[PDB]
């Protein structure tokens, strides 16, 4: 049961939740990876890792993924959360030097992950381990695009560092552009392809219906995170959240801002339902009779299915994960699972 201010009946009724059969193993393997790569303190992994639900979130998303592919995606996903925590703590403690160095190392590791598998910074070595494995599934053309996309994500984190250091809250439109990067829209979109076993040609994945379906899936996920993570983020002096930009620049009250974010999230859903029809008509057009057309048709169909699955996975993740349960913390500004 979800709180009325967070509840989305259309999700509950029309996007039934899915779970990949590898999830029980996935849960433990990622937990152990976090442990052995020293990405989270050992006692924090035992106390909090399972309750954080990072593996549940990916296992509800990339349905159909080879077990190995889902494992690398889940390790990378968990790493991303730990990176978000590190970024947060570097900002809070004014470690601009340590953040700048991490940022540079991540850019280099991204292009040559093999070189960085045993780097002395365990956050960098962990990144490189997951990225090296992601690079093993599809041609190097897909790897180059993932890298291009993630260099942009790191730089958006650097922009957030600048904003929070200066006490700047982005305008609403500026925020919406930044959020496509800090949420890593195009990374989750990229990872649809190794999950269905096919790198999509530019002409296919840039078709308007595929692009728009892919975008709305991510806008929904990012803004729903904004809605649900607003309490802990206000508490932690986070300034990046659609709700916070509206309060700051459109002078809404908190209640008005929650309402406005809800309405924007709702519209993503019914916009997605419209363009999903087009995206699936496109998948049928790809099935032209040929082997390649059938491969491409099947892959777009799977990808669009998972774009849909993201809605329910993200929806339930925010109600299940301890990441957001600020009311339970001794210090509302310092989550228990973060290394402070
Ligand atoms: C901070 C984590 N993340 C990706 C794991 C940043 C790129 C956004 C996110 C939050 C909640 C659900 C899904 C993604
Ligand atoms: Mg963040
Ligand atoms: Mg965050
Ligand atoms: Mg958030």
Curated annotation (Swiss-Prot):
As to how many cofactors bind and how, the note says: Binds 3 Mg(2+) ions per subunit. Can also use Mn(2+) and Fe(3+) but less efficiently, and other divalent cations such as Zn(2+), Fe(2+), Co(2+), Cu(2+) and Ni(2+) are nearly completely inefficient as cofactors.
List the EC numbers from the record. Answer: 4.2.3.37
Query: What is the official name of this protein in its record?
Result: Epi-isozizaene synthase
Q: Where does Mg(2+) 3 bind?
A: 225, 229, 233
The gene designation is: cyc1
- Enumerate the catalysed reactions: (2E,6E)-farnesyl diphosphate = (+)-epi-isozizaene + diphosphate
Q: List the disulfide bonds.
A: none
Residue positions binding Mg(2+) 1: 84, 88
Family of the protein in this entry: Belongs to the terpene synthase family.
The entry's function note states: Catalyzes the cyclization of farnesyl diphosphate (FPP) to the sesquiterpene epi-isozizaene.
Query: Any keyword Magnesium?
Result: yes
- Organism of derivation: Streptomyces coelicolor (strain ATCC BAA-471 / A3(2) / M145)
Alphabetical list of Pfam families matching this protein: Terpene_syn_C_2
Q: In which pathway does it act?
A: Sesquiterpene biosynthesis; epi-isozizaene biosynthesis
Q: Which residues form a coiled coil?
A: none
Q: Which UniProt keywords apply?
A: Lyase, Magnesium, Metal-binding
Please name the CDD domains in this protein's record.
Terpene_cyclase_nonplant_C1
Domain of life the protein comes from = Bacteria
User: In which residues is Mg(2+) 2 bound?
Assistant: 84, 88
Question: Where on this chain is DDXXD motif (motif)?
Answer: 84-88
The free-text domain remark for this protein reads: The Asp-Asp-Xaa-Xaa-Asp/Glu (DDXXD/E) motif is important for the catalytic activity, presumably through binding to Mg(2+).
């Amino acid at each position: 049961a979800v709180p009325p201010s967070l509840r989305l009946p259309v999700i509950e009724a029309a996007f039934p939740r899915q779970l990949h059969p590898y999830w029980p193993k996935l849960q433990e393997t990622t937990r152990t990876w976090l442990l052995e790569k020293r990405l989270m303190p050992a006692d924090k992994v035992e106390e909090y890792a399972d309750g954080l639900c990072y593996t549940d979130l990916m296992a509800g998303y990339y349905l159909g993924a080879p077990d190995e592919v889902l494992q690398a995606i889940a390790d990378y996903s968990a790493w991303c959360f730990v990176w978000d925590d590190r970024h947060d703590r570097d900002i809070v403690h004014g470690r601009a030097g340590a953040w700048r160095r991490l940022r540079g190392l991540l850019h280099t590791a991204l292009d040559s992950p093999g070189d960085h598998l045993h780097h002395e910074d365990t956050l960098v070595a962990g990144f490189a381990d997951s990225v090296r494995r992601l690079y093993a599934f599809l041609p190097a053309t897909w790897n180059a695009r993932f890298a291009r996309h993630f260099h942009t994500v790191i730089e958006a984190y650097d922009r957030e560092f600048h904003n929070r250091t200066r006490g700047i809250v982005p305008g609403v439109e500026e925020y919406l552009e930044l959020r496509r990067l800090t949420f890593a829209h195009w990374i989750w979109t990229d990872l649809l392809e190794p999950s269905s076993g096919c790198e999509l040609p530019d002409a296919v994945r840039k078709h308007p219906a595929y692009r728009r379906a892919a975008l709305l899936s991510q806008e929904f996920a990012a803004w729903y995170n904004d809605l649900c993570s607003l309490p802990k983020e206000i508490a932690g002096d986070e300034v990046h959240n659609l709700g916070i930009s509206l309060i700051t620049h459109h002078s809404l009250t908190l209640e008005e801002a929650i309402g406005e974010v809800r309405r924007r999230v709702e519209e993503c859903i019914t916009e997605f339902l419209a363009v999903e029809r087009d995206a699936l008509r496109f998948a049928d057009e790809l099935a032209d009779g040929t082997v390649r057309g059938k491969e491409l048709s099947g892959a777009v169909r799977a990808n669009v299915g998972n774009m849909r699955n993201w809605f329910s996975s993200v929806y339930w993740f925010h109600h299940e994960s301890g990441r957001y349960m600020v009311d339970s913390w001794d210090d509302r500004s310092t989550p228990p699972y973060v290394n402070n």
